Amino acid sequence: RTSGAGGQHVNRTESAVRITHIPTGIVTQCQNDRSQHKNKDQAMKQMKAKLYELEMQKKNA
Amino acid sequence: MIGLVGKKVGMTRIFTEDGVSIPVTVIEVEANRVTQVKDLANDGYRAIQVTTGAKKANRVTKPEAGHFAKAGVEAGRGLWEFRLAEGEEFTVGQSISVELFADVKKVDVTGTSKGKGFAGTVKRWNFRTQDATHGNSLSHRVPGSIGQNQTPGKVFKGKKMAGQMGNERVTVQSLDVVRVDAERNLLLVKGAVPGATGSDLIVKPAVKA
Amino acid sequence: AVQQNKPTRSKRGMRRSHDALTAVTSLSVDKTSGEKHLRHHITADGYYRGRKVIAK
Amino acid sequence: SNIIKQLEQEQMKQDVPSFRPGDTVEVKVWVVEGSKKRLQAFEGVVIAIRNRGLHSAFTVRKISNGEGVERVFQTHSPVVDSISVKRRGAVRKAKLYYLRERTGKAARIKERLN
Amino acid sequence: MIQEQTMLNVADNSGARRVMCIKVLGGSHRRYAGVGDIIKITIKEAIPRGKVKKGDVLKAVVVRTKKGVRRPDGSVIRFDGNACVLLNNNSEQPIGTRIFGPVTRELRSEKFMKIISLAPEVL
Amino acid sequence: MRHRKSGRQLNRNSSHRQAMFRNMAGSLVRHEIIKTTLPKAKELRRVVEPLITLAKTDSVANRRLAFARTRDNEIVAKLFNELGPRFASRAGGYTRILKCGFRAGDNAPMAYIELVDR
Amino acid sequence: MKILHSAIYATGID
RNA sequence: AGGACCGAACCGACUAAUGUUGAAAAAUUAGCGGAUGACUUGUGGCUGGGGGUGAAAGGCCAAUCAAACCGGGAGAUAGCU
RNA sequence: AGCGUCGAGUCGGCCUGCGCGGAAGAU
C-alpha cells in the first residue's frame, strides 16, 4: 500500500513498490505514482543507477 | 477386565520414608454383589450387573425388590454393569471385594464432576476477556464475534458458547494405586478424582497402561 | 432488533400453549374442624392437624 | 470423616514440642545431599502456625547472609527431624507478618518470662 | 516466577547491581522462570569499575525468588527478593568469582556446581 | 455458585439484615407469636433460638452479651427470667413455624412463628 | 461524529 | 496593595463511566477551573430581521438562524419522483 | 531377440478412429 500520499484513506491500493537486489542487498522503493507499473519502472531506474554507482565506486578505488 | 463401584470419602496425604508427600484420594470400595450375569445367547454380550450399598425398604419399589429377590442379594443403592473379558466368569450372588485391585498398579476412575451451572464463555472455554478500560463499553466478558459477514452467513455447529458446565461423566486415566486396604474396604489412589464427597465412583484397571 | 413480518395468531397460540395454569390437585380436610385447607397449611379458623394453633 | 481421621492420626508424630508464634525455634532437616544423609539446622522466629492435624505447618523467618528467608515446614513430615524452642517470645497476634518490613532494632521481640 | 520486564538483583561480584529480564528462554510462549532457569537480561545499574557495563545483553540463572521453590514434602522456601547470577552469553558460565547470599538445592546440577561451591549457604 | 453456604440475603445488605433480625427477635420474644414471611421466619430461627440457649445460664457476662445482640433491656430481662427457666429442660426446638397462606398486597408466602411452650 | 437530522449518526461512505 | 495564593458557597464545564424508546429533547457519578474581580446575581428598561448584538464561534436573537416567527401573494414553480 | 548358434517373421516410418498424462482453492 502507498504509505505516502494516500496511506491515510480507508481505501488503499498496492501501488507502492519495493525492489530489492537479492545479491547486493540494496533496497529501492517508489510510491510517487498511482500505478504500480510506473512505480516499478521508476524503482528499476533507481536501482540500476545505484548499481552503476557501485561499479563507478569500484573504479574510484 | 471389570472394575468396582465405590464412594468418594475425601482427600488426604501419605508421607513416605524418603519425605515424599503423596496426595491421595480415599475411596470406600465395599463388597459388590452380582445381581445378573449376561451371556451372548439371551443378551448378546457378556457382562455382569453389580450392586453396592444399602437402601431403605420403604423406598425400594416392588419391581426393584423382585429383581433383587431373584438375584438373591440384598438391595443396594444402584445397579451398574461391567463388560466381561474373555476367560472371565462370575456367578449370581457372588461378592467382589477391593482385593481385586491387589496387583493392579494403575486405575481409571470415572465419576460425575461438580456442577458449575450456567457458565460463561470465559469460564467454560477459557475465552480471553476484552479490555477493561481504554473506552470499552459494556463488553468485558462477552464472547465477541461468532461468524462472518456472509459465506456461510450462519453460525457453525459446535460453536463455543455459554451454557451448562459440569455435572457430567468425567474419566481420569492412569492413576497410581497407592494402597488397597482390604480390611477397611479402602482404595487409595494418587491424585484427585471427579466429583464431590460422597459421590459414586467407578474404578477400573487402566486401559492405556 | 424487530420483526420483519407480522407473527400470526397460530404462532401466538403455539407460544401460549405452555401458559395454562394448574389447579390444586386436592385439599386436605382437618380432622377436628373438618374445614378444607391446603396441605401443610393451617385452616382459616386457625386449626392445623386437629389443634387450634392460633387463637382466632 | 472417621476414615480420614484414622488414616491421618496413624501418621502423626507424638514428639512434637509446643511452640507459639514469636518463639525462636531451630529445626533439623535431612538434606539427603548426594549419597550422604546429613542434618541441617534452620533457626528463626516462628511467624505463622497452621493447625490442621496431619496437615499442620509452621513458618519460620531467618535472616541469613543479609537475606531474609522464610521456610514453611510440615509439622509431621518425615524430613523434619527435630524442633527445639531456643527462646520464647511475647506477642499478641497469631500471625507476625509485620516483621517482614522491619530489620534491626525494629524486629526485636520481647521475651515471655512467665 | 520471573517474566519479562522483571527487575532482579545480582548475587555475584560481576560488577552489575540491577538487571531486567528481557526474554524467558526455554521454549515457545514460555511465561515464567523459576530458580535454575536461564533468562536473557540487560544491565541497568553497575558499579563504576567492573567486568560488565550498563546496557549489556547477557544470560543469567535465577537463584532466589520471592515466589519460592517447593519441596517434595510440600514445604516452600521463600526469599525476600529476586536474585540472579550473570553468565557468559556463549559458554553459560558465571562471570564473577563470588556468590552473595544463600541459594537452594534446585541448582545442584552439573551445570551450576561452580555456583553451588561458591555459595555461602545452600538451603 | 453457592456450594455449601448458609445465609439468606433477602435483597438486603449486612447492616439492614442485622437490624431487621434484631427488631424481629425482640418482637418475637415480646409477643411470643408473630406473623411474617416464610423465608424470614426460617432465618429468624437461627438468631432467636441461640438467644434462648444463652439465657439458660444467668450471669453478668451473658446478660451483657444478650444486650449487645438485642439492644433491648426489656427483652434481656424477659429472656433471663422467663424464657430461660421455661426452656431450661428443652434443648434445640424453642420455636415453631406454621404456614398461613399468602399475603394480599403481594403473593408473599406468610407464616406464623411462635414459642413451643405457648 | 456528526449527528444528522432525526438523531441518526453520519456514518456514510465518503 | 495585588485582573496575588490555597480553598467552601457561587459561577463554569477539562476527562472518564452510565444513559442515549434516558430520571433528563444535553443529565447523573467520580475527579476538574475561577473563586476581590475584565467577578457573580435579583428587578425593571433599551437595541427587530438583510436588521439587532457579538473579548468574533457565522455565534445568539423563546428547544427554530449563512438571514427568526405568524398571516398573505399562493393552488409560486417543479422538463423530477 | 537371446547366448557361430538359433529356427519364423521382423523393423521402423505415413495417414487415420477412440483413449492416457500434462490437470492445484478455499461452507
Added chain:
RNA sequence: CACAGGUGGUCAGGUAGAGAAUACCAAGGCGCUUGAGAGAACUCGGGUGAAGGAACUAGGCAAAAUGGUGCCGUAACUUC
C-alpha cells in the same frame, strides 16, 4: 409527568474542626407509591488480591498513589 433538572432573599444549635468543608447528633422533617423470593451467564457501582510492575494502549485512558501542622532544608534559570 406526582419528571434524579432549574429557581432570588432571610435564620444559622452541640462535639471535633481554621472554617458556612467534613463525620456524628439536637429542634424539625423524612424512609423518596409496586412488592415477595432465588442468589445462573451477562451488565452497572464498589472491596480485596499471590509473583511481576505499563510488558496494556494511539496515548499511564481508567484505576492506583500523594495529601495536615510545626521545624530543618531546597537547584538551573530569572523581568530579582
Added chain:
RNA sequence: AAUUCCUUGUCGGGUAAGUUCCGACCUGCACGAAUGGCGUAAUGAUGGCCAGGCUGUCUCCACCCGAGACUCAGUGAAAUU
C-alpha cells in the same frame, strides 16, 4: 521547523531494540523581519518525549458485597409488519 515532497535526510544522545523526542548539519520542493523575525522568567483542565513511585492497564484473571438480569402476584409500552 505547527513550514522539508524526496524522508524513517545524515551524525550524535537516550532504549536490548526509538517512522516519536532532544542536540547538530544546511541540500530552505515551498522561513524570514509589525498579514512581524529571533529569544524569553512566570503562567496554561495546551501539543510531544523521558524518569521515580504507584498500581488488575496487562501476563491472567479469582473471590466477595450490592442494583438489574431469573421466578411469583398486580399494572402494563415501543420500534417494525
Added chain:
RNA sequence: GAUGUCGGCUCAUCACAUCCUGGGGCUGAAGUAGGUCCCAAGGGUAUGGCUGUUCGCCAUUUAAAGUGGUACGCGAGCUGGGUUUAGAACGUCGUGAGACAGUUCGGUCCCUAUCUGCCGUGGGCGCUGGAGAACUGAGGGGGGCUGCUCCUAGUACGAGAGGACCGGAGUGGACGCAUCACUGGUGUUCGGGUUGUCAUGCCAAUGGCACUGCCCGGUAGCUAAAUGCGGAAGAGAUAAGUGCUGAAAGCAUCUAAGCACGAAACUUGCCCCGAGAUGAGUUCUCCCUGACCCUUUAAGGGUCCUGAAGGAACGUUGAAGACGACGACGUUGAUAGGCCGGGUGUGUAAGCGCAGCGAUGCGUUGAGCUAACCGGUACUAAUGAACCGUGAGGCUUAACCU
C-alpha cells in the same frame, strides 16, 4: 426512499500452491548440515522498540514464527488512533471568497432479538396393556503438538576437525480435563486493634454511623499461581516410493495374472453424547384374572362395582440448579434448623483482686467468642389422607404344544 469504511481487540472457519513435525526419489548426498522434487492438512505455527498503521526495519526467542479465501471474515460483538463535517494555524495557489492525493492541535459510534443459525435446558405425544431399572450401539462430537538431556556411542563415517541411522529411557514448554491433600488469593455471615461522634441515666461494658469508617488475621465454599492425569502403543487399508515372480515383446520389465512392503493423512483403537435409530431396539423385574344393559352391532357406547404396580402433588432440602429438570428424606424418620461434643480461627473476654499518682501492667486465663466444618441427638418442621394412573391388552399368517 442508505450494503458504515483502515488498523487494533475477541472469536473464528476453510483451501494446499506445506513453515515445523511425518514418509520418500535425485544429489556436484563421506558424516553433521544442506539443495531440489514427490506424497501428506492430524496437530502446532513468538514477545517487545518505532509508527494510527497493514507492512517494514530492529532486539531477543522458537521445531516453526506458512501462504491465501471467508463483504481486503468479524462495529444490531468492543474500540475510534487514521479516515481533514463543522474551529484554528503553518508552507503553497489566487486580487478575493476559499483550496491542497501537503502538514499540525481539537473533535457525540443508537437499537429491550420476531424468523433462520448456534449454545444449554424443559413440556406434549409417539414407540400399540401399564410401570421401574440395566443395557446394546446406527450415528455424532472431543483429542492427535513438540523441545532438551542421557545410553547405544565418541561407535558407523571422516586425513583431521567433527560426528551419526535404527532403537531405548528421563525431564520440560504450550494446550486440555479434573480437584482442593499442599502452597496462596478471596472470604462486607468469625475474632481482635483503633479514630471521630451519638446513644444505652452515669463509671465500666457495649451498640449505630462515618467505603466493611480505617485496618490486622482468618472457617467453609469458590479458585490458580497450586498438583494429579492426557496426547499414545497396537491393528486394517493405503499415498509417494520400494520390491518378488512374470509374459505381452524367446531379452528386458513392480503388473497385464498373482504376491510382499510402505506415513502425524483414512478406518479403528482412547474419552463423551447417543433407540424421536418413526428402521422408535434388547434384557430383568413388578401390577391388573367383576357384572349388566343398549346399539348406527364393531379395534362401538353406557351404567354399577373396582383403583393395582407406579406416578404426580405437598413439605424438609442438596457440594443439583436462572425456571423446569436431577438427587436425598418425610415419624418404621438424621432431610433441614436448633442442641451437645470436637475441630478451626482470633487471641489471655467480662467481673473481681493486687501494684502504680495515672496511663497502664499482673492474676484468675490460652481466657472468652467462634459462619458455611466434623461426629451425634427427634427438641422443631417434614400429618392421616386425597389425586392421576384400571380391571389381562387388535388382525392375518406361520411354527410347535394340545
